[PDB]
Design a binder for this molecule. Structure first.
Ligand SMILES: O[C@@H]1[C@@H](O)[C@H](O[C@@H]2CCNC[C@H]2O)OC[C@H]1O
Length: 302
């Protein structure tokens, strides 16, 4: 096949991108993204602050611009994200304890109701683990509300939209030997033992010199799949966009039956949150980089 999404679809997978609503007037952006991807994540518009800028007062305008663009262009949508320490609106940042817990639940219920039946995967909880050697939970208002915040978010989501696949998403959890990875593994294992409703694990896959790709990513993906969850590569970007690493990651997904697909975190290098690291598949002018060709060839089986 001639495009990433179509090539992925031949093996039953998707190839997605992050979409920014403010860029939906950019003809190069929309035409390349339209052609190449069959899955969309809103880069910012489905986050807590965007969707609930005042408590109880939802604003889906920008989110729906992304959603509607996706489905008008034949893509499915991953919802990102319902419960996270970052990009909280001010009103939620000030809450703690039981009041925060109620607001977290209310936010999940309101957003999922708006999209009920329409979104195939939700990143219900994002980035709950600390970096480094401890495997501890990240300090946040949510974590301070109790260790059960994650499980409660998942149980809330399962009740709100039983059709959605519920994902836990994080970064620096790709290398099988890292403490953070093992913390996430043991959480998912615990959730499956205690009946907590988790369907998928998202590996953000932000690879760079401080958190480099390792061939053991395939092992990580296999081992999580064996716990009885799907796995997905959710926010892939790679410092310098080396073709070799991009091919390795693609082949790791293709090797694991329950790897649903790959999303890259943007279209052109200049669209990237980390543009200075030139970490994506298209040049600033929209042309294909060497890494594009390596991914397409891997998806096509040679
Ligand atoms: O525009 C930027 C987004 O790309 C960025 O997205 C996060 C990358 C790290 N993982 C979670 C994602 O939501 O969020 C910051 C924003 O400024």
């Amino acid at each position: 096949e001639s495009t990433l999404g179509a090539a992925a679809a031949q093996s039953g997978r998707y190839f997605g991108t992050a979409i920014a609503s403010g860029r939906l007037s950019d003809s190069t952006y929309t035409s390349i993204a339209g052609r190449e991807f069959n899955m969309v994540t809103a880069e910012n518009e489905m986050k807590i602050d965007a969707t609930e800028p005042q408590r109880g007062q939802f604003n889906f305008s920008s989110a729906d611009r992304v959603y509607n663009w996706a489905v008008q262009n034949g893509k499915q949508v991953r919802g990102h994200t319902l419960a996270w320490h970052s990009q909280q609106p001010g009103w939620m940042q000030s809450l703690s304890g039981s009041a925060l817990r109620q607001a977290m639940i209310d936010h999940i219920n309101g957003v999922m109701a708006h999209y009920k039946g329409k979104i195939v995967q939700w990143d219900v909880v994002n980035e709950a683990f600390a970096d480094g050697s401890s495997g501890a939970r990240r300090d946040s208002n949510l974590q301070r509300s109790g260790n059960d915040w994650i499980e409660v978010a998942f149980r809330t989501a399962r009740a709100a939209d039983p059709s959605a696949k519920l994902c836990y998403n994080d970064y620096n959890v790709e290398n099988w030997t890292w403490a953070k990875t093992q913390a996430m593994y043991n959480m998912v294992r615990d959730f499956k033992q205690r009946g907590v409703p988790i369907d998928c694990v998202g590996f953000q896959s932000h690879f760079n010199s401080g958190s480099p790709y390792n061939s053991n990513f395939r092992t990580t993906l296999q081992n999580f799949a064996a716990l009885g969850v799907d796995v997905a590569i959710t926010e892939l970007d790679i410092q310098g966009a080396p073709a070799s690493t991009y091919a390795n990651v693609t082949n790791d997904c293709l090797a694991v039956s329950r790897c649903l697909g790959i999303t890259v975190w943007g279209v052109r290098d200049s669209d990237s949150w980390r543009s200075e690291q030139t970490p994506l598949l298209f040049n600033n002018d929209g042309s294909k980089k060497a890494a594009y060709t390596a991914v397409l060839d891997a998806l096509n089986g040679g």
